[PDB]
Amino acid sequence: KKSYTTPKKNKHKRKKVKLAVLKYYKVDENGKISRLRRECPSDECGAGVFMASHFDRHYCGKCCLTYCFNK
Amino acid sequence: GGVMDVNTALQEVLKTALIHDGLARGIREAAKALDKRQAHLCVLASNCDEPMYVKLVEALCAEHQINLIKVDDNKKLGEWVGLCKIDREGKPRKVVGCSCVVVKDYGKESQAKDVIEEYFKCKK
């Protein structure tokens, strides 16, 4: 019947903004790749997916309900 | 088979590689492809976004699997794989570079792919 009234909140999660991604391997010497944190060897990871070093946390987007330390 | 030119040979790879879905486009998939042993071919190209990644791709070839080939001009590889596959005579919505791609066991192994690539690879 009736049509909607007026709220004012109108936000979005974030658009997963376009950034320069993969510098999780750091260039030091040739041809070495200097990891700062593990490229996770979970129980289904192929070791082609990194794990976030959050600071205060340890979180993978694939292992997101499991394998999440708080350090 | 082939005429044993590096570019039109790598095209014969790419035909069946498209069907095989061996194409690991973008840095995250490129990294994952060469950190995996399922890759068998790599081609790189000129500065797309950084002069850092062109270095990094060589760094990954060093540590994991040397297989590298360099064919410059991002627009080349960008044309070569469209939205999922090369698409249309035209297509002005995209033609953007893939900048480097990695293909898995020359796509399919069925015919000429093995000989054309093997001729180049042990030399390079």
* Alpha-carbon span B24 to B27, nearest angstrom: 8
Q: Which two tokens stand for residue B102?
A: 């990695």
Strands (E), A1-71: 25-27, 33-35, 52-53, 58-59
Is B28 an interface residue toward A (CB < 8 Å)? yes
B57, closest residue in chain A (CA to CA)? A31
Is A68 an interface residue toward B (CB < 8 Å)? no
Domain that holds residue B123: 1-124
Q: Which two tokens stand for residue B51?
A: 């002069």
Beta bridge partners of B41: B103
What's the number of domains chain B is made of? 1
